[PDB]
Amino acid sequence: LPARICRDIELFHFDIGPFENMWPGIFVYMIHRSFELEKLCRFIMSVKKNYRRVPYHNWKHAVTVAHCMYAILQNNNGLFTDLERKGLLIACLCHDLDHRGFSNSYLQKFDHPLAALYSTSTMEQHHFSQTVSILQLEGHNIFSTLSSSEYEQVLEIIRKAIIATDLALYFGNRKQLEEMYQTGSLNLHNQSHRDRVIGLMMTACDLCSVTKLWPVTKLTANDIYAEFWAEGDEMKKLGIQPIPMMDRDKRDEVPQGQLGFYNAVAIPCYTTLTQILPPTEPLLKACRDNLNQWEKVIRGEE
Numbered sequence: 001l002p003a004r005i006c007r008d009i010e011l012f013h014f015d016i017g018p019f020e021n022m023w024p025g026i027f028v029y030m031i032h033r034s035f036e037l038e039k040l041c042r043f044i045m046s047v048k049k050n051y052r053r054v055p056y057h058n059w060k061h062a063v064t065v066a067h068c069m070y071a072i073l074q075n076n077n078g079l080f081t082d083l084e085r086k087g088l089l090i091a092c093l094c095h096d097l098d099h100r101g102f103s104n105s106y107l108q109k110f111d112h113p114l115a116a117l118y119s120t121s122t123m124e125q126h127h128f129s130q131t132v133s134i135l136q137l138e139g140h141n142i143f144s145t146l147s148s149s150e151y152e153q154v155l156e157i158i159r160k161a162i163i164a165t166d167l168a169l170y171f172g173n174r175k176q177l178e179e180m181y182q183t184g185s186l187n188l189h190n191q192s193h194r195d196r197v198i199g200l201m202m203t204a205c206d207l208c209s210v211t212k213l214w215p216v217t218k219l220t221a222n223d224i225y226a227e228f229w230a231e232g233d234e235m236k237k238l239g240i241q242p243i244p245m246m247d248r249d250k251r252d253e254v255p256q257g258q259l260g261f262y263n264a265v266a267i268p269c270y271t272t273l274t275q276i277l278p279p280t281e282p283l284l285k286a287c288r289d290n291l292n293q294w295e296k297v298i299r300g301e302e
């Protein structure tokens with residue numbers, strides 16, 4: 001891989017660039033550095049094909065989330081098993097499979113068939129189900145050299161991690177982790193605690209846009225709102241007044257909305273993550289920097 005990417009990929013704030021045909025080799029590099037090479041590529045290409053041309057929750061997003069996981073895992077050597085590392089990187093690549101740019105709330109209000117099938121964490125459950133189906137295509141079982149027991153195990157890791165990208169679950173998960181940390185009861189050798197930490201890692205990776213340098217973070221914000229505002233339109237088509245976040249009428253309040261989001265979700269997230277895994281600190285610093293940028297925008301300086 002290019003010398004610059006070889007080096008810069010180790011940075012938390014790395015951007016994977018605009019060349020799509022480079023991203024598979026970035027993922028393969030990361031996952032080799034953290035498989036049957038033919039099956040892997042085959043698997044990656046099918047996953048890519050199941051992603052949609054939507055502004056934010058797309059193929060680029062998936063590799064970006066996977067990269068963040070890579071960086072966390074590299075800077076916390078010895079904490080997670082070889083399996084967990086494989087499962088988590090795959091989970092990240094697959095977590096938004098078949099995303100159509102709408103939230104679980106809209107699918108519910110639309111009375112989408114997936115909401116009858118999966119009452120809770122609707123999209124996330126469907127994404128895992130899609131992932132399993134891709135794995136079950138001829139020549140796509142990247143876990144073929146594992147035993148059945150380890151196969152079942154890695155799928156379980158993947159399922160929980162994908163489900164954890166439902167931001168509705170973040171709030172209780174992080175609250176529980178925070179109290180475990182502050183009381184000294186947090187035990188990484190406890191599987192249930194360990195699952196929670198992985199959940200928070202998944203949230204941290206999924207939101208990692210907010211931990212890039214400002215020019216990246218600033219531009220990506222256009223992508224998330226393009227999805228959010230289209231959902232607000234569809235909500236209005238259902239005869240339902242959307243929440244401000246998804247109302248394009250309220251686009252002038254975007255800086256204030258971002259402030260809200262960083263204060264309520266993103267800062268607490270990386271703060272807790274940094275407490276549990278100190279080497280993730282750069283994610284929190286970059287997040288804090290971006291919060292400061294949004295504050296300057298509101299002052300009319302940016």
Ligand SMILES: Cc1ccc2nc(C)c(-c3cc4nc(N5CCCC5)cc(NC5CCOCC5)n4n3)nc2c1
Nearest residue numbers: 207209210224244245250251253254257258260261264
């Ligand atoms: C990069 C990234 C990734 C995920 C994100 N998820 C959310 C939910 C948000 C987000 C956006 C937003 N916009 C808001 N408004 C814009 C104009 C009116 C309000 C408001 C919010 N969140 C408020 C925070 C407190 O509860 C009320 C909603 N968010 N969040 N940003 C993300 C950014």
Ligand SMILES: [Mg+2]
Nearest residue numbers: 057095096165
């Ligand atoms: Mg998602």
Ligand SMILES: [Zn+2]
Nearest residue numbers: 095096165206
């Ligand atoms: Zn995502």
